[PDB]
Amino acid sequence: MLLDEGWLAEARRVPSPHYDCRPDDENPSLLVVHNISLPPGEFGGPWIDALFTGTIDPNAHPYFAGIAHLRVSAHCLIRRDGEIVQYVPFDKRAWHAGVSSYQGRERCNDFSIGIELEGTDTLAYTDAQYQQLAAVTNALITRYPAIANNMTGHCNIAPERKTDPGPSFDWARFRALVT
Ligand SMILES: C[C@H](N)C(=O)N[C@H](CCC(=O)N[C@@H](CCC[C@@H](N)C(=O)O)C(=O)O)C(=O)O
Ligand SMILES: CC(=O)N[C@H]1[C@@H]2OC[C@@H](O2)[C@@H](O)[C@@H]1O[C@@H](C)C(=O)O
Ligand SMILES: [Zn+2]
């Protein structure tokens, strides 16, 4: 698949107010794999889109009140059925990493692209998600060659704060699909 001005040519575009500029409009060089599910352990809601666009109803589930105060986003979500949703163009800074460090460099939001897999640390991701994650990643690598050398989990850049994408994320299968 192709990239069009920072947007996946093939994705549902859900443009989020939750983004700003990368410092000096630097090119991203790191892919951070995440997972997300809202409410925890459940799939298919509107809640992920709502969280990443700042419109979530704090009252729709006991879990939501707590994260309503957050200001977060990711570049893309890949749903259980493989559907790709993009909230932030890749050249812009999404708010997905939080306090983090990679190879000595902090504030990974600055130089990373965040892709969220709908799922949990302990449940297998779907065949569609691996296929689609790979297609997106291959596209990103074409545009930003350094990503080929720099793919990581949120848990690796924020250890003992974050666990996503967890043991369930099969790095071997994923890497085999990439470039
Ligand atoms: C969606 C993502 N996976 C997420 O929820 N994780 C959050 C990611 C949170 C995150 O990036 N905050 C940013 C800033 C948040 C908003 C701020 N720029 C603004 O203008 O309002 C940071 O620390 O620079 C986590 O790890 O704490
Ligand atoms: C424990 C945690 O920090 N919060 C979960 C929760 O679910 C939605 C929102 O709040 C998201 O920030 C999140 O994280 C994970 C798994 C992630 O960063 O991918
Ligand atoms: Zn994460």
Swiss-Prot record:
Its cofactor is Zn(2+). Changing residue 164 to A: Loss of activity. Zn(2+) binds at residues 34, 154, 164. Its EC number is 3.5.1.28. Zn(2+) is required for amidase activity. Gene3D superfamilies: Peptidoglycan recognition protein-like. It is found in: Cytoplasm. It comes from the Bacteria. The keyword Hydrolase applies. SMART domains: Ami_2. Belongs to the N-acetylmuramoyl-L-alanine amidase 2 family. This is 1,6-anhydro-N-acetylmuramyl-L-alanine amidase AmpD. It comes from Citrobacter freundii.
